Design a protein around this nucleic acid. Structure first.
Length: 94
RNA sequence: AUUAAGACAUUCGUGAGUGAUUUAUUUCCAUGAAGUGGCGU
């Protein structure tokens, strides 16, 4: 299981659209590795990892030129899960 | 010409007087104006 963000950024570069930044999207847990390229001959698992810690709808991706943006918008694909409050609670007492 | 004849059960007379469709009853019960951040390790 890997990122939905890296999931998203993979297809934007599948056509010519250069995103701002100097380092490729992260693979692997550790080390300073970079991979703007194929994962591996076998394949990779992509799931909406960030849904469980608070569902999000619209993702702005900063194109190289400020002039435009690129937007990814998320929907339940069957109109069931339109919400998820973050399953974490922050309590500040004294 | 005969125990006959004669005689409107009629006159007068308000179905009227008194009397609230009123009394009692919560438009109320349940319900988070809330959720999420995104972008260049």
């Amino acid at each position: 299981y890997r990122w939905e963000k890296r999931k998203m950024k993979q297809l934007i570069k599948a056509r010519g659209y250069e995103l701002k930044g100097d380092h490729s999207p992260i693979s692997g847990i550790r080390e300073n590795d970079n991979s703007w390229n194929d994962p591996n001959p076998n394949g990779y698992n992509y799931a909406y990892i960030r849904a469980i810690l608070g569902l999000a709808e619209q993702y702005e991706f900063q194109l190289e030129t400020p002039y435009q943006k690129a937007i990814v918008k998320i929907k339940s694909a069957n109109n069931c899960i339109s919400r998820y409050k973050s399953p974490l609670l922050f309590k500040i007492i004294n």
